[PDB]
């Protein structure tokens, strides 16, 4: 869920709040197309892109299905209790907070005007 993804990312990126990651680009957050703007962003289109499939799942709701994960030591796992919905939305989200960790942030990226921007 959400609050779960939250956590993903505090824990790959403690360097940042991570409300930064919510708002930013063509496709992180709220946003959901156009040309991604940079890295992080298309880390973001995956990442949005990967729970449309999951949502393909029966009763799958990616920001609301609880998953079963860990973050220790530097690495997150989604665990071996996860059902076919749950192994997806976690696989997302852990992919996506490995991928925020390692792009670039803009500050200019940050709130862009998506109905001008993200056509
Ligand atoms: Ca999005």
């Known amino acids: ?58 009763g799958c709701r990616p920001y609301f299905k609880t998953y079963s994960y860990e973050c220790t030591q530097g690495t997150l796992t989604c665990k071996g209790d996860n059902n076919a919905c749950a192994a997806s939305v976690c696989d997302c989200d852990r992919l996506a907070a490995i991928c925020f960790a390692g792009a670039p942030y803009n500050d200019a990226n940050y709130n862009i005007d998506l109905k001008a921007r993200c056509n």
């Open 1 to 58: 869920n959400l609050y779960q993804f939250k956590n993903m990312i505090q824990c790959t990126v403690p360097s940042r709040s991570w409300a930064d990651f919510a708002d930013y680009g063509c496709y992180c957050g709220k946003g959901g197309s156009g040309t991604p703007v940079d890295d992080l962003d298309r880390c973001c289109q995956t990442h949005d892109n990967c729970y449309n499939e999951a949502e393909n799942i029966s």
